[PDB]
Every structure is written in structure tokens, then in C-alpha cells.
């Protein structure tokens, strides 16, 4: 439904979800390595209502 920027992260809204991208790179919704989670990974926070 929307494009929004938030702390270097491109972001989309969704059915109920908020999906922010990677910190340095806008067009990337996946972490660099699922070994060693590295604090810049994309986040999937469902709006809990």
C-alpha cells in the first residue's frame, strides 16, 4: 500500500505487516547471511492489534 523511508531503510506496508529493507541497500529484503545475524538485516514486524 505505501513506500516509506525510515532510518536508511526502504519500507513497505502490507496486509498487516511492515517490511523494512536493508540499511545500506534499498532494493534488498534479505539478510546478507543467515549465519551471524548482523544488525542490518531486514525486519518483519506484524502490527499486533
Amino acid at each position: 500500500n505505501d513506500v516509506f523511508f525510515f532510518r536508511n531503510r526502504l519500507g513497505f506496508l502490507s496486509g498487516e505487516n511492515i517490511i523494512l529493507s536493508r540499511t545500506a541497500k534499498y532494493f534488498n529484503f534479505y539478510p546478507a547471511s543467515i549465519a551471524n545475524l548482523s544488525d542490518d538485516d531486514p525486519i518483519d514486524v506484524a502490527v499486533s492489534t
Binding site: S33, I34, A35, N36
Partner: protein, 149 residues
């Protein structure tokens, strides 16, 4: 479908047995070590080529190659491995049956030819997921790559 048997060199009289698919494929006994010419037979590549010759004669299609430090048992697009064990003869550190599922980053085979994948699982020491690592032959590294399917 694929598989690797590492070889690391003998040590003066043990049995080297490679079970593929249930049968007792590829037996060899390192000699007694009494005569001085038997020190040639603990060479890793000589042992690899003898194990691969036994492997080719005792399996039907099963294309295997003598690598730098392995033999690369492949199944010919039909049947699978379905059972893969290796009676070392010495302790665990003589010949290693290694597959696509090593359980740490330290236990990981030395050459493992160019297109090869390992699902690193666990080690139960850090709260970590299970990540996949591919080898490269031009640059001898182990970088992380995708899943299979």
C-alpha cells in the same frame, strides 16, 4: 546423490572399507610394514586410486573421480546412495565419509570439488540457524550460497 570419501594416508596395516548402497564395496588392507617398499602404499593418492579402481569395478555406472584428496562417488541419475558408511580401520582420522551435511565449520572436507554444497547444521554451541556453504576451485575458499530447491 553424490558423496565424498576423503583419504589421508594409511598407517601400516588396517582395513579400508567403503559401503555404498549396502554392499561391501572397495576393500583394501594396507600391508604389514615389514619390507621397506611397503611405505609406498601409505601414499594418499595411491590409496585413492586403488579405492577408486575397486569402486569402479564393484559398481555399475557410478562415475567416481580421483581428486586431490577425495573420491567423488556419483549416482547415475536414477538410484541414490541410501547408505554410506566407511570402516576406517584406524581411528576417525584416516579416511572420512563426508556428505552434504557437515555439522560445523571446522569439520569440512579439504578439497571438495568445485560444485559442492554443505548444509552446516547446529554444533549446539551458539543460537544459530543452519546455513549453506559452497566451495570454489579457482579461489580456495568456502563462501555462503543459496539453498538447493
Amino acid at each position: 546423490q553424490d558423496g565424498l570419501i576423503n583419504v589421508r594416508g594409511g598407517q601400516y596395516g588396517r582395513e579400508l572399507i567403503v559401503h555404498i548402497n549396502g554392499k561391501d564395496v572397495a576393500k583394501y588392507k594396507i600391508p604389514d610394514g615389514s619390507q621397506p617398499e611397503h611405505v609406498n602404499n601409505t601414499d594418499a593418492q595411491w590409496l585413492a586410486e586403488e579405492l577408486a579402481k575397486q569402486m569402479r569395478t564393484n559398481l555399475s555406472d557410478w562415475t567416481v573421480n580421483v581428486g586431490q584428496g577425495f573420491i567423488h562417488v556419483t549416482a547415475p541419475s536414477g538410484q541414490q546412495i541410501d547408505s554410506f558408511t566407511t570402516k576406517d580401520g584406524y581411528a576417525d582420522q584416516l579416511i572420512n565419509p563426508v556428505t552434504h551435511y557437515a555439522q560445523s565449520f571446522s569439520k569440512l572436507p579439504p578439497n571438495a570439488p568445485n560444485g559442492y554444497m554443505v548444509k552446516i547444521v547446529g554444533d549446539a554451541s551458539k543460537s544459530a540457524d543452519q546455513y549453506y556453504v559452497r566451495y570454489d576451485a579457482e579461489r580456495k575458499v568456502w563462501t555462503e550460497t543459496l539453498g538447493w530447491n
